[PDB]
Design a protein around this motif. Structure first.
Motif, mmCIF file in Angstrom:
data_model
loop_
_atom_site.group_PDB
_atom_site.id
_atom_site.type_symbol
_atom_site.label_atom_id
_atom_site.label_comp_id
_atom_site.label_asym_id
_atom_site.label_seq_id
_atom_site.Cartn_x
_atom_site.Cartn_y
_atom_site.Cartn_z
ATOM 1 N N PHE A 127 0.840 -1.219 0.000
ATOM 2 C CA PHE A 127 0.000 0.000 0.000
ATOM 3 C C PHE A 127 0.859 1.246 0.000
ATOM 4 O O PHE A 127 1.778 1.291 0.767
ATOM 5 C CB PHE A 127 -0.919 0.002 1.214
ATOM 6 C CG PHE A 127 -2.128 0.833 1.027
ATOM 7 C CD1 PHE A 127 -2.061 2.200 1.147
ATOM 8 C CD2 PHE A 127 -3.326 0.250 0.749
ATOM 9 C CE1 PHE A 127 -3.174 2.973 0.959
ATOM 10 C CE2 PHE A 127 -4.444 1.018 0.564
ATOM 11 C CZ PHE A 127 -4.372 2.379 0.673
ATOM 12 N N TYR A 128 0.572 2.208 -0.888
ATOM 13 C CA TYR A 128 1.258 3.494 -0.964
ATOM 14 C C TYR A 128 1.153 4.249 0.371
ATOM 15 O O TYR A 128 0.045 4.678 0.768
ATOM 16 C CB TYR A 128 0.641 4.323 -2.084
ATOM 17 C CG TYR A 128 1.372 5.555 -2.603
ATOM 18 C CD1 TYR A 128 0.670 6.525 -3.274
ATOM 19 C CD2 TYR A 128 2.719 5.727 -2.462
ATOM 20 C CE1 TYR A 128 1.289 7.623 -3.811
ATOM 21 C CE2 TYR A 128 3.367 6.819 -3.006
ATOM 22 C CZ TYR A 128 2.638 7.774 -3.678
ATOM 23 O OH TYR A 128 3.223 8.903 -4.224
ATOM 24 N N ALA A 129 2.286 4.340 1.079
ATOM 25 C CA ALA A 129 2.305 4.687 2.499
ATOM 26 C C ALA A 129 1.751 6.084 2.762
ATOM 27 O O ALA A 129 0.908 6.268 3.629
ATOM 28 C CB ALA A 129 3.696 4.575 3.058
ATOM 29 N N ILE A 180 -3.375 16.231 -6.197
ATOM 30 C CA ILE A 180 -2.517 16.089 -7.376
ATOM 31 C C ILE A 180 -2.623 14.668 -7.967
ATOM 32 O O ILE A 180 -2.841 14.485 -9.163
ATOM 33 C CB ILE A 180 -1.043 16.390 -7.039
ATOM 34 C CG1 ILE A 180 -0.839 17.898 -6.747
ATOM 35 C CG2 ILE A 180 -0.163 15.899 -8.159
ATOM 36 C CD1 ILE A 180 0.516 18.238 -6.154
ATOM 37 N N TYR A 181 -2.530 13.678 -7.109
ATOM 38 C CA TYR A 181 -2.492 12.275 -7.505
ATOM 39 C C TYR A 181 -3.689 11.848 -8.358
ATOM 40 O O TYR A 181 -3.551 11.030 -9.273
ATOM 41 C CB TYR A 181 -2.387 11.436 -6.222
ATOM 42 C CG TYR A 181 -2.601 9.938 -6.356
ATOM 43 C CD1 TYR A 181 -1.536 9.094 -6.482
ATOM 44 C CD2 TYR A 181 -3.879 9.372 -6.295
ATOM 45 C CE1 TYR A 181 -1.708 7.727 -6.580
ATOM 46 C CE2 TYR A 181 -4.068 7.992 -6.402
ATOM 47 C CZ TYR A 181 -2.968 7.178 -6.526
ATOM 48 O OH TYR A 181 -3.081 5.810 -6.647
ATOM 49 N N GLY A 182 -4.860 12.393 -8.056
ATOM 50 C CA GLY A 182 -6.081 12.029 -8.781
ATOM 51 C C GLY A 182 -6.645 13.132 -9.652
ATOM 52 O O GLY A 182 -7.785 13.050 -10.088
ATOM 53 N N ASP A 242 10.927 11.851 -11.121
ATOM 54 C CA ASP A 242 10.790 11.900 -9.655
ATOM 55 C C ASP A 242 9.744 10.960 -9.070
ATOM 56 O O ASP A 242 9.919 10.430 -7.964
ATOM 57 C CB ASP A 242 10.503 13.312 -9.189
ATOM 58 C CG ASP A 242 11.600 14.303 -9.611
ATOM 59 O OD1 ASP A 242 11.275 15.532 -9.623
ATOM 60 O OD2 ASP A 242 12.753 13.848 -9.936
ATOM 61 N N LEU A 243 8.650 10.756 -9.788
ATOM 62 C CA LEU A 243 7.588 9.830 -9.356
ATOM 63 C C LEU A 243 8.078 8.350 -9.386
ATOM 64 O O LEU A 243 7.778 7.511 -8.485
ATOM 65 C CB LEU A 243 6.385 10.082 -10.249
ATOM 66 C CG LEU A 243 4.958 10.010 -9.723
ATOM 67 C CD1 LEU A 243 4.702 10.747 -8.410
ATOM 68 C CD2 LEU A 243 4.072 10.527 -10.842
ATOM 69 N N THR A 244 8.914 8.050 -10.375
ATOM 70 C CA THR A 244 9.502 6.743 -10.491
ATOM 71 C C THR A 244 10.371 6.534 -9.240
ATOM 72 O O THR A 244 10.268 5.497 -8.588
ATOM 73 C CB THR A 244 10.362 6.597 -11.764
ATOM 74 O OG1 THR A 244 9.523 6.713 -12.941
ATOM 75 C CG2 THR A 244 11.103 5.263 -11.735
HETATM 76 CL CL LIG Z 1 1.516 11.173 -6.017
#
Ligand SMILES: [Cl-]
Length: 583
Positions: free
Chosen positions: A149-151, A290-292, A237-239
Motif C-alpha cells: 500500500f502506498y504509504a 494532485i495524484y487524482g 521523480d515519481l519513479t
Molecule cells: Cl503522487
C-alpha cells in the motif's frame, strides 16, 4: 562518509506524527502476522531513537542506515521465530541481504481472519477512549493486509477515517451514518491498494522503464499543456518515489513525494491551472489532490500529430539515433491528444508505431512503408471499444450480482486450475468495473474500464504467482504488461481441463452461515457456483441457476427456521443429490 544522521533528517523532514505513522506502516508490511502490540513497541523504540539523534547527532545508532535500524530492532524481538521462522533466517544475514530477505517475505494474501468491523457503538467508543491507539490499529490492519500500500496515501485514508468518525459518533443514529461512509472509504482504499500493487509489479518485474512509459502517458493525458521536458521531470521523480515506496523505504518515499508536490505547486503556471485547487491545501490533501487530478482540457493549436511522426523527413533518423527520446515524444504527443484512450491502449499504439518503424526503416523506401502507420492503429482502437460496449450492455442488462455470476462462469472456464477463492475474488472485482465505469460518458469510459481491468488482472497475476497452477495465467502475466488485458480477453474456455469430482463436504453447512450478512451469503453462493463449474465445465446457466437457486432456497428456508441444524442436516444432503440430478 561522515554524514548527517539519516533518521534525524527524515524525522525532521516529515515531522513526528507522520514519522510515527510511516514507521508503523514499515513494520506492519515487513512482519504481517505479528500482533499490533509488538509493532507498537517497535515504533516506540525507533521514535525514541530518532528523537535522541535529533538532539545529539553523535548518539548511539544515529549513523546507521534506516535499513539497519529497522533490521536490528526486528532481530531483537524475543518472540520472533514463533510467528514465521521464515524471517528467523533473515536475521543471520548482513545488510543488504538481510533487508532483501525481509522484502521477499511480503505476502499478498496473508492467512488472516477477515477484517472485522465492530458495531457502531463499539467502534465509536473505541475511537473516543484512545484516538492514537485506534488510528494505530487502522494503519496496522490495512498495511498488514496490503503490504505494498502506498504509504503516504494510507496516512491520508487514516485522516478521512478520522473525519467520518468525528462526524458520525456524535450524531443521533450512529450505524446508519457510519456504515455507508466507511463502506465508501473501504472501496476507495481497495482501489488505491490495487493501483499501487501494479506500480510495484511493473517496477519490480518489468523494470523502471515499464513504469516510466506508463506514467508518461498518464501524465501527458492529465497535464497536456505542460511541455515534454516538464512531464519527463515529473516522471523521473515519481519513479523514484514509487521505487522507494514499493521497496519499503517509506520515510524516504513520503519525503520525496512532498518535495514533488512542492515542485508542481511552484511550477503550476507551466503545468495546469487545475493545480490551483490543490496547491493551497495541507500536504496529505495536497498530494492526494494532485495524484487524482482531473485531466486538463486539450490545448488549442496543436498541429496534426502526423507532421512530426509520419511526414518529417527525419523520422527514421530520429528513431535510430535517439530512440527513447523519440518514442517518449511520440507517447507524449499522441497521449496529450487522446484523454479518451486508456493508458494501456496508448502504450500499445506506441509499441505498434515502434514495431512499424523497426520494420520500415530497414527497407529502401521507409516513408512508403510507414505512411499509413497512424491509420493502422484503428483495429487496436476498436477492439477495446467493442469490449467496453458489449460488457457494459451485458452489465446494464443483468445488474451487479448476475454480472459477477456471468464473469465467474466465464473466468472459471478460461482458467479452471486457478484456486476458487482467487476466482471468486477476481470475478467480483471485474464485476465492480462495470458498476464504476459503465454509466460514465464515452469520453472517459474506455480509460476507466481498461485501466481498472489492468489493476484487477494484476491482482490475479500476483495471487497466482504465489500459488502457480495455470500455464495460461503465467503466460499472460509474464509475457507483456500492456498486452495482458487483450491476452486474457482472447482466452477461450479450456477444453483440456479434467473436471474434478464434487467434494461431498462442499454443501455441508453448520448454520454458522446464518450469522452472515446477505453480502457474505452471496460470496458463499458464488464460491459454490465456481465449484459447480469446475465439476461440470459445460453446465448451462439454467442448470447453474437451479442448483444455486436451490441453495438460495435452502438458506432462505433454514436460517429463518427455528433449529436451523435439523433443517440444514436434512436439507444439505438433499442438495448434493439434487445437484447431481440437474448436472
Ligand atoms: Cl503522487
Amino acid at each position: 562518509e561522515a554524514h548527517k544522521s539519516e533518521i534525524a533528517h527524515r524525522f525532521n523532514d516529515v515531522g513526528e506524527e507522520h514519522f510515527i505513522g510511516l514507521v508503523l506502516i514499515t513494520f506492519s508490511q515487513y512482519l504481517q502476522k505479528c500482533p499490533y502490540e509488538e509493532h507498537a513497541k517497535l515504533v516506540k523504540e525507533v521514535t525514541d531513537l530518532a528523537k535522541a539523534c535529533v538532539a545529539d547527532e553523535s548518539a548511539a545508532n544515529c549513523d546507521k542506515s534506516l535499513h539497519d535500524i529497522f533490521g536490528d530492532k526486528i532481530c531483537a524481538l524475543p518472540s520472533l521465530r514463533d510467528t514465521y521462522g521464515d524471517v528467523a533466517d533473515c536475521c543471520e544475514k548482513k545488510e543488504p541481504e538481510r533487508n532483501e530477505c525481509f522484502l521477499h517475505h511480503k505476502d499478498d494474501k496473508p492467512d488472516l481472519p477477515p477484517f472485522a468491523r465492530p458495531e457502531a457503538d463499539v467502534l465509536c467508543k473505541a475511537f473516543h477512549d484512545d484516538e492514537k491507539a485506534f488510528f494505530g490499529h487502522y494503519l496496522y490492519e490495512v498495511a498488514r493486509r496490503h503490504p505494498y500500500f502506498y504509504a503516504p496515501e494510507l496516512l491520508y485514508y487514516a485522516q478521512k477515517y478520522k473525519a467520518i468518525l468525528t462526524e458520525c459518533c456524535e450524531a443521533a443514529d450512529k450505524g446508519a451514518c457510519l456504515t455507508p461512509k466507511l463502506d465508501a472509504l473501504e472501496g476507495k482504499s481497495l482501489i488505491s491498494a490495487a493501483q499501487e500493487r501494479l506500480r510495484c509489479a511493473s517496477i519490480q518485474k518489468f523494470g523502471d522503464r515499464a513504469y516510466k512509459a506508463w506514467a508518461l502517458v498518464r501524465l501527458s493525458q492529465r497535464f497536456p499543456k505542460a511541455d515534454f521536458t516538464d512531464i519527463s521531470k515529473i516522471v523521473t521523480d515519481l519513479t523514484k518515489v514509487h521505487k522507494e515506496c514499493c521497496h519499503g523505504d517509506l520515510l524516504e518515499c513520503a519525503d520525496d513525494r512532498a518535495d514533488l508536490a512542492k515542485y508542481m505547486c511552484e511550477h503550476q503556471e507551466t503545468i495546469s491551472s487545475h493545480l490551483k485547487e490543490c496547491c493551497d491545501k495541507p500536504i496529505l490533501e495536497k498530494a492526494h489532490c494532485i495524484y487524482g487530478l482531473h485531466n486538463d482540457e486539450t490545448p488549442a493549436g496543436l498541429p496534426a500529430v502526423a507532421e512530426e511522426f509520419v511526414e518529417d523527413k527525419d523520422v527514421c533518423k530520429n528513431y535510430e539515433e535517439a530512440k527513447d527520446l523519440f518514442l517518449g515524444k511520440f507517447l507524449y504527443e499522441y497521449s496529450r491528444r487522446h484523454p479518451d484512450y486508456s493508458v494501456v491502449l496508448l502504450l500499445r499504439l506506441g509499441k505498434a508505431y515502434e514495431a512499424t518503424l523497426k520494420k520500415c526503416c530497414a527497407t529502401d523506401d521507409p516513408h512508403a512503408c510507414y505512411a499509413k502507420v497512424l491509420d493502422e492503429f484503428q483495429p487496436l482502437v476498436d477492439e477495446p471499444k467493442n469490449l467496453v460496449k458489449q460488457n457494459c450492455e451485458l452489465y446494464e442488462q443483468l445488474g451487479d450480482y448476475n454480472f459477477q455470476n456471468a464473469l465467474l462462469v466465464r473466468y472459471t472456464k478460461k482458467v479452471p486450475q486457478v484456486s476458487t477463492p482467487t476466482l471468486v475474488e477476481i470475478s467480483r472485482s471485474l464485476g465492480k468495473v462495470g458498476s464504476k465505469c459503465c454509466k460514465h460518458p464515452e469520453a472517459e469510459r474506455l480509460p476507466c474500464v481498461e485501466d481498472y481491468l489492468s489493476v484487477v488482472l494484476n491482482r490475479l497475476c500476483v495471487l497466482h504467482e504465489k500459488t502457480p497452477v495455470s500455464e495460461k495465467v503465467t503466460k499472460c502475466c509474464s509475457e507483456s504488461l500492456v498486452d495482458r488485458r487483450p491476452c486474457f480477453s482472447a482466452l477461450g474456455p479450456d477444453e483440456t481441463y479434467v473436471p474434478k469430482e464434487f467434494n461431498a463436504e462442499t454443501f455441508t453447512f453448520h448454520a454458522d452461515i446464518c450469522t452472515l450478512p446477505e453480502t457474505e451469503r452471496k460470496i458463499k453462493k458464488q464460491t459454490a457456483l465456481v465449484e459447480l463449474v469446475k465439476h461440470k465445465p459445460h453446465a448451462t446457466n439454467d442448470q447453474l441457476k437451479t442448483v444455486v437457486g436451490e441453495f438460495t432456497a435452502l438458506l432462505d428456508k433454514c436460517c429463518s427456521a427455528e433449529d436451523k441444524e435439523a433443517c440444514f442436516a436434512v436439507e444439505g444432503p438433499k442438495l448434493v443429490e439434487s445437484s447431481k440430478a440437474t448436472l
